JSON list of C-alpha atoms and ligand atoms in Angstrom, two decimals:
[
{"chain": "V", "resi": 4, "resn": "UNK", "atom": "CA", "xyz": [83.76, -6.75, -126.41]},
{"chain": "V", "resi": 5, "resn": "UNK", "atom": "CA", "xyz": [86.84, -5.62, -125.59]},
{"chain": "V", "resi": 6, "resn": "UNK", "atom": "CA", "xyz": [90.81, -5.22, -126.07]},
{"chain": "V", "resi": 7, "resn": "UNK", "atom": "CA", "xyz": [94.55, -4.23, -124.40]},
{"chain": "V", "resi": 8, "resn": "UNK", "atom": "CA", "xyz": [96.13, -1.52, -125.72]},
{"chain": "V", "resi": 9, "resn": "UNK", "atom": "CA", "xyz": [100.10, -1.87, -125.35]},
{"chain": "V", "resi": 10, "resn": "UNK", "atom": "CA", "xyz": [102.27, 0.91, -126.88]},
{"chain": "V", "resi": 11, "resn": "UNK", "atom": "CA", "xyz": [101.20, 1.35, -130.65]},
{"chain": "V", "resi": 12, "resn": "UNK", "atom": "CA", "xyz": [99.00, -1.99, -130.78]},
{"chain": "V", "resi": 13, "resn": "UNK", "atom": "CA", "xyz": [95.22, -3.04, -130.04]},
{"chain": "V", "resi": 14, "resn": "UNK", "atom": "CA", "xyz": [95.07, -6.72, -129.06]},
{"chain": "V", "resi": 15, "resn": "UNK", "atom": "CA", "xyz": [91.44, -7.63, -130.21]},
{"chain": "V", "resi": 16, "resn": "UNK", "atom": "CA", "xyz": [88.88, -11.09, -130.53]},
{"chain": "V", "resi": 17, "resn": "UNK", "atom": "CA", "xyz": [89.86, -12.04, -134.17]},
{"chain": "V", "resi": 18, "resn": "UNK", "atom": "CA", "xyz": [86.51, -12.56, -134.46]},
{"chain": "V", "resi": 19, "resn": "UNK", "atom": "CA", "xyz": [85.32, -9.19, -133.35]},
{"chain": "V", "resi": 20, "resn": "UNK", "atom": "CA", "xyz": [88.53, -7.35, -135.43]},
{"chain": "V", "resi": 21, "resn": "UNK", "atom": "CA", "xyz": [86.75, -4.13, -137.34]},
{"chain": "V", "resi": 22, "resn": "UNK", "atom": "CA", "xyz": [87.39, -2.74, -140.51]},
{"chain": "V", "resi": 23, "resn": "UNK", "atom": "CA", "xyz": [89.84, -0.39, -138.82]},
{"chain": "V", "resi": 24, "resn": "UNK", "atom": "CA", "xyz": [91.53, -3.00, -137.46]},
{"chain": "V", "resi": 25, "resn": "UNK", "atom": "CA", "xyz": [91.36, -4.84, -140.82]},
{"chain": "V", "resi": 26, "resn": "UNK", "atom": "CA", "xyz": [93.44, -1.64, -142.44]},
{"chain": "V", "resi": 27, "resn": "UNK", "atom": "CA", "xyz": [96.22, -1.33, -139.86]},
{"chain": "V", "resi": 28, "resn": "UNK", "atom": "CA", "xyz": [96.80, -4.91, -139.65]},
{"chain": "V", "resi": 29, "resn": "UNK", "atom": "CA", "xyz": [99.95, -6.04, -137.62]},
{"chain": "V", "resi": 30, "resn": "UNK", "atom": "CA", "xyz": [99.63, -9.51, -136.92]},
{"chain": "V", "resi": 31, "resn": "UNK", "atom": "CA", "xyz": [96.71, -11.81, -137.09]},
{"chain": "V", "resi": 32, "resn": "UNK", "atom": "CA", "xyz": [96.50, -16.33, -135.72]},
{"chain": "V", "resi": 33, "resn": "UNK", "atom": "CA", "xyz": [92.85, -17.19, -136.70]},
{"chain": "V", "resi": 34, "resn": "UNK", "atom": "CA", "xyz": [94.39, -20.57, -134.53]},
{"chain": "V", "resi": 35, "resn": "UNK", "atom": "CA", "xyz": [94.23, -18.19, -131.47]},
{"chain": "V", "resi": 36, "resn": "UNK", "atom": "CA", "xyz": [91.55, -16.01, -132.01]},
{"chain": "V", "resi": 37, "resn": "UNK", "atom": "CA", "xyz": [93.72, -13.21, -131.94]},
{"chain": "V", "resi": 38, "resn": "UNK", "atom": "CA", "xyz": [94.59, -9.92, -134.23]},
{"chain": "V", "resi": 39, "resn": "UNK", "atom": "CA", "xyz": [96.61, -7.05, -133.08]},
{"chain": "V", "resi": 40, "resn": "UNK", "atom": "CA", "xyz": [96.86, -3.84, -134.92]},
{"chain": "V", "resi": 41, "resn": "UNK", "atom": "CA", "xyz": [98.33, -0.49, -134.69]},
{"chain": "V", "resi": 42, "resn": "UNK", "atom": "CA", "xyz": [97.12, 2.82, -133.00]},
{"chain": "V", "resi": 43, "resn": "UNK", "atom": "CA", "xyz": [98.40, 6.51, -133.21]},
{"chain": "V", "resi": 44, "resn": "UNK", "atom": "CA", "xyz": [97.87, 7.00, -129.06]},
{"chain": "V", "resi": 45, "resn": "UNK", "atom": "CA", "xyz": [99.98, 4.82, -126.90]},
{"chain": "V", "resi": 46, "resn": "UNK", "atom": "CA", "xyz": [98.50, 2.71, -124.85]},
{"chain": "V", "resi": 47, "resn": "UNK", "atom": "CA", "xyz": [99.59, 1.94, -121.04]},
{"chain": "V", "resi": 48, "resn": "UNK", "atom": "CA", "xyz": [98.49, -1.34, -120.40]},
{"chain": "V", "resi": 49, "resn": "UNK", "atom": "CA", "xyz": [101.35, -3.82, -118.82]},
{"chain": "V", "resi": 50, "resn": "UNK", "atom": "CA", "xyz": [101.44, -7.55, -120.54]},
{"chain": "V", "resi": 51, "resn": "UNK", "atom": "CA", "xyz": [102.29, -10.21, -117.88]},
{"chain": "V", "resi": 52, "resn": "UNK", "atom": "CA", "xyz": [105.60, -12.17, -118.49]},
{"chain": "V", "resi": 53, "resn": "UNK", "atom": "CA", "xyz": [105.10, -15.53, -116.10]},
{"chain": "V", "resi": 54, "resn": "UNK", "atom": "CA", "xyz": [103.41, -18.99, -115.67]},
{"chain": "V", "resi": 55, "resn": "UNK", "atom": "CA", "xyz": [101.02, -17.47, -113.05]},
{"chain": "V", "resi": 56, "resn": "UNK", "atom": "CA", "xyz": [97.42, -19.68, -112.98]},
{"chain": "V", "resi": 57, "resn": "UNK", "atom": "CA", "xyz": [95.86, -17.70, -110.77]},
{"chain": "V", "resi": 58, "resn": "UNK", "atom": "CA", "xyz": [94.06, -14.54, -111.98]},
{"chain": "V", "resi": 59, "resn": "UNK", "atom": "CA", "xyz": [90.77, -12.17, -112.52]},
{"chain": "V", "resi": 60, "resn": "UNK", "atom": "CA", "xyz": [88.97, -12.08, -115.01]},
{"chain": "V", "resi": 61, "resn": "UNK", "atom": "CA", "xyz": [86.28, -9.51, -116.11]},
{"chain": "V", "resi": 62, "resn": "UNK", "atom": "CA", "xyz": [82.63, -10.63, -116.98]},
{"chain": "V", "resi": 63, "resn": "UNK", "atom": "CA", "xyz": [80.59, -7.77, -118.90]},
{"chain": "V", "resi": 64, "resn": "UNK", "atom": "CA", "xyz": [77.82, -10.60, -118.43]},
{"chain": "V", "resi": 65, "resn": "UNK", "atom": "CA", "xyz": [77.41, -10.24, -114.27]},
{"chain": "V", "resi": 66, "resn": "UNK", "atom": "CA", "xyz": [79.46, -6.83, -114.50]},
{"chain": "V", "resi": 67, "resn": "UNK", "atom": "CA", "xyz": [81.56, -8.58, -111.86]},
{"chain": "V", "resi": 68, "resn": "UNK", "atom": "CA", "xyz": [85.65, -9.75, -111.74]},
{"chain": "V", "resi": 69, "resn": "UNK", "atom": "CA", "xyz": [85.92, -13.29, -110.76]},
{"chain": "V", "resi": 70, "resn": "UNK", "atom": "CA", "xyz": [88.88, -14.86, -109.78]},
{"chain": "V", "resi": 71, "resn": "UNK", "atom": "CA", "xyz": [90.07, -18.17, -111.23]},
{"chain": "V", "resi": 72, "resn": "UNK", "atom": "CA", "xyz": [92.48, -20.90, -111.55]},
{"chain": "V", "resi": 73, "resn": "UNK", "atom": "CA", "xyz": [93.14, -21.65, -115.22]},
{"chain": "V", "resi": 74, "resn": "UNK", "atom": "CA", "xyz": [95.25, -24.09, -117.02]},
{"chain": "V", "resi": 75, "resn": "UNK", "atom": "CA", "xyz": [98.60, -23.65, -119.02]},
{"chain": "V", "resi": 76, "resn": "UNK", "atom": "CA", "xyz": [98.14, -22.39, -122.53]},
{"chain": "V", "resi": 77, "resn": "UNK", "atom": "CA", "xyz": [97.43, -25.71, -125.11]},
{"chain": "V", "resi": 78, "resn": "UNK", "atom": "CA", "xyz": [95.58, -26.66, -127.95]},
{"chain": "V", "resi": 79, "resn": "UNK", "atom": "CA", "xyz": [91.64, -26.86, -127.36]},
{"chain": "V", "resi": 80, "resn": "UNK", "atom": "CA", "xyz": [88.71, -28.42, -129.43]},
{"chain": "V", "resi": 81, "resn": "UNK", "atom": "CA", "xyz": [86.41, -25.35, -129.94]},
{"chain": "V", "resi": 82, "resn": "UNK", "atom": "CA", "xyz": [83.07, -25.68, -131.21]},
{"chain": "V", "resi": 83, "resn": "UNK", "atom": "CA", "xyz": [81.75, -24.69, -134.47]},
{"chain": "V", "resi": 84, "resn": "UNK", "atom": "CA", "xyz": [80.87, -20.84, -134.86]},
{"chain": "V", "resi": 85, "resn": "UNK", "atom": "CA", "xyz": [79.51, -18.36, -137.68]},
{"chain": "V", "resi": 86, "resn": "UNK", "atom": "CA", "xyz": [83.49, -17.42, -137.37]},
{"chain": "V", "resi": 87, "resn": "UNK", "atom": "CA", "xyz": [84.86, -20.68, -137.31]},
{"chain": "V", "resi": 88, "resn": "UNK", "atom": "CA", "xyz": [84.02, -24.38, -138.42]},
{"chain": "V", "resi": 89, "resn": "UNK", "atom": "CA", "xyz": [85.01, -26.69, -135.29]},
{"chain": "V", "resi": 90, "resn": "UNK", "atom": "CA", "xyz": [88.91, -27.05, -134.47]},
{"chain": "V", "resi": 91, "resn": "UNK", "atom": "CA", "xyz": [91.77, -27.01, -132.28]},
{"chain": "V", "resi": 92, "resn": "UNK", "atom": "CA", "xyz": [91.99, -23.47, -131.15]},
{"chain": "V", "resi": 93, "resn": "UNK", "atom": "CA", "xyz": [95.85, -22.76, -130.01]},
{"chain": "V", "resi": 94, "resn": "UNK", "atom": "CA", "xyz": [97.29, -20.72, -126.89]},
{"chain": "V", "resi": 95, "resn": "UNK", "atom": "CA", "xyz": [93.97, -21.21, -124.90]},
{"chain": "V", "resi": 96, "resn": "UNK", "atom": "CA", "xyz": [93.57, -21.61, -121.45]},
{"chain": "V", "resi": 97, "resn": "UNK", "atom": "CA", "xyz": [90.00, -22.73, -119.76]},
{"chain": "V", "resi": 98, "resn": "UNK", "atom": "CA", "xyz": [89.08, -21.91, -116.39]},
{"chain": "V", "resi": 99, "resn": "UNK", "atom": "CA", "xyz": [85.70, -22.71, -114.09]},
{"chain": "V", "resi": 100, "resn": "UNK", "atom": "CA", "xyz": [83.38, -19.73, -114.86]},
{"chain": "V", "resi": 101, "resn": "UNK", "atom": "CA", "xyz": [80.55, -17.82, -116.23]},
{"chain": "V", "resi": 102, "resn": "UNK", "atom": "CA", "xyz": [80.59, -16.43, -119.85]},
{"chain": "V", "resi": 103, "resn": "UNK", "atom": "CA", "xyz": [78.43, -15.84, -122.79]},
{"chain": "V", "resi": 104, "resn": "UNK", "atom": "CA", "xyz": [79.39, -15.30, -125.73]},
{"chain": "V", "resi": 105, "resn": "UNK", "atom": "CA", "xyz": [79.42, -10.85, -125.75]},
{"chain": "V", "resi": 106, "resn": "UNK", "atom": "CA", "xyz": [81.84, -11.56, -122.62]},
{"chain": "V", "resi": 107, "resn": "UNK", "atom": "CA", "xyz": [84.67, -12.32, -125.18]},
{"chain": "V", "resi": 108, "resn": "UNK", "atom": "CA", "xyz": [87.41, -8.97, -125.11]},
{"chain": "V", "resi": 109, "resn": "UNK", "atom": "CA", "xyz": [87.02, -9.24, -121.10]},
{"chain": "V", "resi": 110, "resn": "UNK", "atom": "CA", "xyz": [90.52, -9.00, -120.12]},
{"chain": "V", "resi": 111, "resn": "UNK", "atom": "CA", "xyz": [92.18, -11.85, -117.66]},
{"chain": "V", "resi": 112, "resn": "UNK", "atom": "CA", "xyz": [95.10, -10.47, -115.32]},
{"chain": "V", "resi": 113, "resn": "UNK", "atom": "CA", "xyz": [97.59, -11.59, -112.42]},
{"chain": "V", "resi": 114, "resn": "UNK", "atom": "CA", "xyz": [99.34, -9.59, -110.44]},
{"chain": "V", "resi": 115, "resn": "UNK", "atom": "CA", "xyz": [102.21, -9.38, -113.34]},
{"chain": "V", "resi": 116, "resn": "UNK", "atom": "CA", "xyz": [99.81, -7.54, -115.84]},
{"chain": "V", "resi": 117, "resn": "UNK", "atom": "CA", "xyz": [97.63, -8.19, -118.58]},
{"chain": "V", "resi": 118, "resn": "UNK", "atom": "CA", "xyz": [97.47, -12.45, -119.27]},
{"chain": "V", "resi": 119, "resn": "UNK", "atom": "CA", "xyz": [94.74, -12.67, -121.92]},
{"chain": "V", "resi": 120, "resn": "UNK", "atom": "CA", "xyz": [91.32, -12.25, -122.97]},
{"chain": "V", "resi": 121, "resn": "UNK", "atom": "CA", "xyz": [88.12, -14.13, -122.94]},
{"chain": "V", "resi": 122, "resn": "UNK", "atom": "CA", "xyz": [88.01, -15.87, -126.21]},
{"chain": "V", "resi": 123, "resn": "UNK", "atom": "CA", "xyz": [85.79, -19.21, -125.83]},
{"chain": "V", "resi": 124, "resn": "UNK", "atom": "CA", "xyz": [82.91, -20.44, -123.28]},
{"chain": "V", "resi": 125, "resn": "UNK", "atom": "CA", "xyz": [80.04, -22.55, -122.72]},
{"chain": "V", "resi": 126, "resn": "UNK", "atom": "CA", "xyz": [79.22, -25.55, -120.20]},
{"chain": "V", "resi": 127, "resn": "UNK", "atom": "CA", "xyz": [80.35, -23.37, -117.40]},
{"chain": "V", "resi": 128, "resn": "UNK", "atom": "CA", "xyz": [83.74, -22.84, -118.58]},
{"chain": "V", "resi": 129, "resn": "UNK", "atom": "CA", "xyz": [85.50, -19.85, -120.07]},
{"chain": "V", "resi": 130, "resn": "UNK", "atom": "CA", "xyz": [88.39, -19.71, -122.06]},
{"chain": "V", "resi": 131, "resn": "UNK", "atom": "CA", "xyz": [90.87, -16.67, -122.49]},
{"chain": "V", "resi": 132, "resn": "UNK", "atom": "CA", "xyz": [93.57, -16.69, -125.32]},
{"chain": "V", "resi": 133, "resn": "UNK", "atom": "CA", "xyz": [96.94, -16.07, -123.96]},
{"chain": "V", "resi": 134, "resn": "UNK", "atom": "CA", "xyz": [98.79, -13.04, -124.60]},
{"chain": "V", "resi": 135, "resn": "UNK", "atom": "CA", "xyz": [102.14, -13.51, -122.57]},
{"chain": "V", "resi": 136, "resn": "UNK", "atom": "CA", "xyz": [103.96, -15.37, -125.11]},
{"chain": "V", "resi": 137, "resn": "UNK", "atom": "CA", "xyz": [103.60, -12.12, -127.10]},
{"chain": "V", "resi": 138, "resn": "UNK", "atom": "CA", "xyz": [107.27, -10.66, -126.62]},
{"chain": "V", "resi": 139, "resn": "UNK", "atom": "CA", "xyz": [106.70, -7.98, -129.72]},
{"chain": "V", "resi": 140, "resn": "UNK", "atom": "CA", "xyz": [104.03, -6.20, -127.69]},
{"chain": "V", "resi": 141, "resn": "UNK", "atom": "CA", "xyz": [106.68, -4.02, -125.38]},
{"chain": "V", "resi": 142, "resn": "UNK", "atom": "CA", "xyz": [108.74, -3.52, -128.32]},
{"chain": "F", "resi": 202, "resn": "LIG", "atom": "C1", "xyz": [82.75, -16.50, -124.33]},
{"chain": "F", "resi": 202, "resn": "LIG", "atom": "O1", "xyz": [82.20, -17.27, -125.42]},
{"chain": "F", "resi": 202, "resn": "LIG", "atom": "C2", "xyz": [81.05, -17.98, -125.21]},
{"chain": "F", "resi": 202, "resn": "LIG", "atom": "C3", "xyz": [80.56, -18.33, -123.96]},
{"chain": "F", "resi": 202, "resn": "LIG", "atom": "C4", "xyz": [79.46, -19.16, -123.91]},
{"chain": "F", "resi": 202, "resn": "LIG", "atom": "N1", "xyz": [78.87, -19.66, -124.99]},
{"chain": "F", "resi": 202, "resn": "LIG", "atom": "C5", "xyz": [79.35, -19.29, -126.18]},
{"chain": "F", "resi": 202, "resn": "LIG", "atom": "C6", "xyz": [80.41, -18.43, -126.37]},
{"chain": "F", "resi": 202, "resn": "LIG", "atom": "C7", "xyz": [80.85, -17.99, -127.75]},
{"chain": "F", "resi": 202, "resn": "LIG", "atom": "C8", "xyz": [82.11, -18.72, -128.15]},
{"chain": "F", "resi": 202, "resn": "LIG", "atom": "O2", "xyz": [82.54, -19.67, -127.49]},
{"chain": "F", "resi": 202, "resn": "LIG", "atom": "N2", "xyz": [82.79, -18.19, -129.19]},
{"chain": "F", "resi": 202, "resn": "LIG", "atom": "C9", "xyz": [82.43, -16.95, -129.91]},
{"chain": "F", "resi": 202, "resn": "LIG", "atom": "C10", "xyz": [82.89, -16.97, -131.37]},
{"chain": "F", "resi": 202, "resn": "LIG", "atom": "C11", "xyz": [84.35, -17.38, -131.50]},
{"chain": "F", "resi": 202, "resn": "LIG", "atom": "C12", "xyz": [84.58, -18.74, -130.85]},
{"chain": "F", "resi": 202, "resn": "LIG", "atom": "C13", "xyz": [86.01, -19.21, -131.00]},
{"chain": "F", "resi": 202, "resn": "LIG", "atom": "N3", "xyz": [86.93, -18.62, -130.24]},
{"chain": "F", "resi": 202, "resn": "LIG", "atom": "O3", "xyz": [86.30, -20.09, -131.82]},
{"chain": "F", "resi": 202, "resn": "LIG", "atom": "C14", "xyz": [84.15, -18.71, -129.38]},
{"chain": "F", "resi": 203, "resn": "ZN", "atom": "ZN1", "xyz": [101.59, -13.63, -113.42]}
]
């Protein structure tokens, strides 16, 4: 579990989106795991704007941060879920490192801000949908 909260939006796991979430839709890519909606309190995290591939990442798994290189953001074959049947998932990045599958909301950051969150995993990799592409968030 997990999400960023930017000004008047909640960036969530598409997959773990609530009803809430669900009635103050703002924007939703099943491609990228991703839905954002809006909140009443403001939020104060800081979305990175950059190429960085270097980053932390947190792991509700170990309770630990890890630090990892990841690659750019592309298209990724994904597995086959109870959310999804098997496809290219879009915007992902995949990085050496622990996760299971409750690990997904961790948050990934640089030392610009917020990058993404864990979205995808298994075979010793973890994947984090990218969020810096997002320019809407700070506006
Ligand atoms: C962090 O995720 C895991 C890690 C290890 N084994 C499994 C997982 C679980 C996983 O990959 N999922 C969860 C359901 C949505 C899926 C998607 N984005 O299409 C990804
Ligand atoms: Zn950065």
């Amino acid at each position: 579990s997990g999400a960023i909260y930017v000004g008047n939006y909640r960036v969530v796991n598409r997959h773990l989106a609530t009803h809430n979430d669900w009635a103050n839709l703002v924007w939703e890519d099943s491609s990228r795991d991703l839905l954002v909606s809006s909140t009443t309190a403001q939020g104060c995290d800081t979305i990175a704007r950059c190429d960085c591939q270097t980053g932390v990442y947190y792991c509700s798994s170990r309770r630990k941060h890890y630090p990892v290189s990841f690659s750019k953001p592309s298209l990724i074959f994904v597995e086959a879920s109870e959310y999804y049947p098997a496809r290219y998932q879009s915007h992902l990045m995949l990085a050496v490192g622990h996760s299971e599958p409750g690990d997904c909301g961790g948050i990934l950051r640089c030392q610009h801000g917020v990058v993404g969150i864990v979205s995808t995993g298994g075979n010793g990799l973890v994947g984090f949908a990218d969020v810096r592409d997002l320019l809407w968030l700070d506006e």
